Design a protein around this ligand. Sequence first.
Ligand SMILES: [Zn+2]
Ligand SMILES: [Zn+2]
Lengths: 340, 126, 550, 170
Amino acid sequence: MESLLQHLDRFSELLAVSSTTYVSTWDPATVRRALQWARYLRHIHRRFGRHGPIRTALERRLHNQWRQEGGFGRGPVPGLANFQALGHCDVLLSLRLLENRALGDAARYHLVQQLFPGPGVRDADEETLQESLARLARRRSAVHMLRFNGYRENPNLQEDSLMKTQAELLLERLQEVGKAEAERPARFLSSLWERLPQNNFLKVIAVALLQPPLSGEGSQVLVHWLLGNSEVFAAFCRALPAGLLTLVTSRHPALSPVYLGLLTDWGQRLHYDLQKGIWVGTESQDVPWEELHNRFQSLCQAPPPLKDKVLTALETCKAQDGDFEVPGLSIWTDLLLALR
Amino acid sequence: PTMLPECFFLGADHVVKPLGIKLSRNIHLWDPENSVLQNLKDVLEIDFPARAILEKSDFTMDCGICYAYQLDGTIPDQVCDNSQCGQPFHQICLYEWLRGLLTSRQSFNIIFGECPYCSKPITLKM
Amino acid sequence: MAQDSVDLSCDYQFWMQKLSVWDQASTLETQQDTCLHVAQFQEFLRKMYEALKEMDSNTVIERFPTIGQLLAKACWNPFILAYDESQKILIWCLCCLINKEPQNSGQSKLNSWIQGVLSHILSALRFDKEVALFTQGLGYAPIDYYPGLLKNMVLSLASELRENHLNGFNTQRRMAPERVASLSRVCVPLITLTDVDPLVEALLICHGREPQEILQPEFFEAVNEAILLKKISLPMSAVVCLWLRHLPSLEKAMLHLFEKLISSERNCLRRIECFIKDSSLPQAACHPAIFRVVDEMFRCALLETDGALEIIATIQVFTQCFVEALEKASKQLRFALKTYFPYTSPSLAMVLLQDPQDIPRGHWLQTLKHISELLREAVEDQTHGSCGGPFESWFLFIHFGGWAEMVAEQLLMSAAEPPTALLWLLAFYYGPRDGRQQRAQTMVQVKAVLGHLLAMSRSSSLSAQDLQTVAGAPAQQLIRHLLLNFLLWAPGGHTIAWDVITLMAHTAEITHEIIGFLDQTLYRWNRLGIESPRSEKLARELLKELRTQV
Amino acid sequence: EGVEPAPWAQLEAPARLLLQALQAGPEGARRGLGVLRALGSRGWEPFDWGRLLEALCREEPVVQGPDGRLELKPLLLRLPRICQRNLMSLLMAVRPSLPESGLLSVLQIAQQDLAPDPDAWLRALGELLRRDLGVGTSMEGASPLSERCQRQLQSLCRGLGLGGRRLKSP
Ligand SMILES: [Zn+2]
Ligand SMILES: [Zn+2]
């Protein structure tokens, strides 16, 4: 049990330095030692990797490693990301050494000769490293070929295949932080928000809010994070399309009263011009009539639990601004007229 | 006609087996100078019933698409709202059928369409 | 050890001049042509690997001129790099071209270039940008999400095909057939990747509403080859769909059964049965289109050869499989036998379907004697409202083993006063298209032979020359087979079988014929559960020793 | 705009049901038989094959091949290829109760005389129906199979000891 800690952390240090350009002192001995250690970890993962204290100990070690590093400053080093990557650690190491230009000639030769010995060893009991890399090359080729011959960006994002993949990764990555309980998930998400591209991230959150559970604590965390952070939710509802927000809001009733409140504030900063029969905003970043109509139409074309909510929120905002029944006076009368 | 026909048996696997056996053993006794009934009776060594039930003879209670009972646990449950058809279906068969036709329109969990046999309004709730 | 360079140096220029045309295969025609020629490229690469393996790098200049360009063009084409082992061999060849100790700077540049192309193969992010950014941010490497990514793309596409299929004639977005054909071209190199079989299975099941085919026959040939070599493992609905929308693939399947009975597994009927059952042809032949095509090929073969025992025994096996699949999966709404066997009277088939497992061993005689009556009526009284001819009734009667083979073994049991109807059936079996004048002479010859053989059996254990006398024409195969059944039946056998077998096996054809006889006979016995262990061990020993002589 | 109606839209309802059933994969022909028993059961016990086999030869226009080329196709070549194959299978099944005058007009289409990109399955089921009527002996090498397959099968049977039977009669 304790024997595996010094094995795994040492291997992780060796792995992390694998990608780094200090390779001068390396030799066949170092490479042989690396790959036999990696075989040992891949053997552990097979033997007693499931349903024991050892699995959870290794997960504690891995996730504690990935949060003590954090991903700030001195190095945004990946590391082996999770316990499943224990079963293919050797492949990571080999790939990193093949990408390191700074590798020495004899090390390179010994490496590649140990990865790809040839068909001298066509008969093997354990799925070896050569087969693993071949299967990887096939998959990478398959992915390229499907992406550029048959794939289409589906408009119903929740049914897309990229967004669904990113989403499942995010959910798994939140589950591990939850089990760790070291730092709160909201801090990870806030750091992500600064770090990576916002437009992409928001579509991904939207999509992860709708994937059914597989262990919905993941979605349960993101709703709390969003309701806590108003600024992101201002761009959440603003950037995405209509039906996605509608399905999100119908799935999570806690997002409904704020969303209508966001829309209710965007109408109020419009002004009607008599010459062109169109509501418009003063500032350029004020939502147009067409987009706002689309949002309310999607909300009305929804389950009954939300239809009455939006309808009452519109009537109460109409009567608040004079209970007119004629256009040119109230954006809310004009909405309710256009819905029918 | 009076010559031997291609003939076989439907029903219970425990009841049908001795009938196939007896047919195999006695099939050489067929003679095309008598009648079909007068040969079948002494071949299978039995007599027939004359309309044991004349009213409830049989109503085919099968999918009316796949013509099977027991498609993957499912039963013929979805029926026609019609006195003249009354034809059962399965959820899966009737969904695959109605999702094709041009007349059909899908609400949230509902599809309205025409019953295959009689072309009357039939509703399917998934 | 004659040529060693020339044919390979020609194929080289061929392939390099083809790769330069292909060039990453971003269009339709490049893709189709790659999908055609890729296999020969694989073999070319095996030969090139042997050549570079036996020798070393940087010293020799045989094909070192453009080997770089060849292996690069190969590598940047992904229809090559996704075929069975092409990637593995290109990796091997690049490993051969490397050098441990570079001396001139050109060799170092080469080694760097090799690392570059290897890195392009394994670990380059030639994909959408934001997904790479997002994953890199979350600290995921390509190796720990590509599988799920592939899986999710495949499920997406497969669902899309299913929904385009269900929306037949509906006011909705129709999956553009360019995309379907594109996926069908992509499935061809990576048919043996388990992570794609859903997409294959979906393409086959989701024919859709078009009058023309949208898939091109390279897809079907690929899938069929893989099904028959046991490299994909689809379900049966998909291989029926395949047969039933590409007819040359069902012919190509039935040929692959003939090589097994002509070349590989002559007279190992257990292996023939195993192949037939693992194959889907019995299950698929419950569609009458496919049974009609299969029997038409059996017929062509019965005619090219003049009644080969090997094809005859194979048909008997196929028919048994087909029967016990028709019964299983034809409960409600089954087709009438005149739909499978449309060239005969249904009476006769309905007799011959009846298995002899169901009947007592003693009541086989009556049933055969009845079958003889029906065949004689159908042939001799060839009037309107009957078979097309004698050959048709024969070709049927041959489909149902048990009956056709049991004839002689019942003659020996009743060799005292042989039944004329059985003699007729036997003469019909070994020769139709003979005429009554020929048939009578044949039957009386057989009757005299049965008299002599019964005399010899009720006598003591006697020689083989007394049998070779009667063995000594148009009725030779019949007498040979009858005499073999005499050997296996009489207890006077297991002493003088060799003495007759050696004399009869002049050629190798007679040896193959006797082997076929004995394999068929043991299959027959082990099936019907009828056995005398003397005859079993005798036949097994003779078969064992004669399979060496051939 | 690009909505296409089903080519059996304008036909007798039971025929419509039959051609809707045969569409459904390899179990299309069995489903065709279930359909015909389910119209023997209903008020119109006979099924008007003679009307369906006219509709199957009736022609309408299509524009296929290049962007522009007007051609006239019958129904049999205009309805979905699995409907076609499961049709012709079902006509093998109920051949005896069919009018020959209609059948021959159908088989002439199936033969696809003078066409590029034929349907081998349609042509082969054509041949197998002709042989079953007894008006397509044809004095030809007109077999269901391909010349390719028939040659590759001669090539293998040549490597086998011919049998003492006499089935061809010179
Ligand atoms: Zn059903
Ligand atoms: Zn109805």
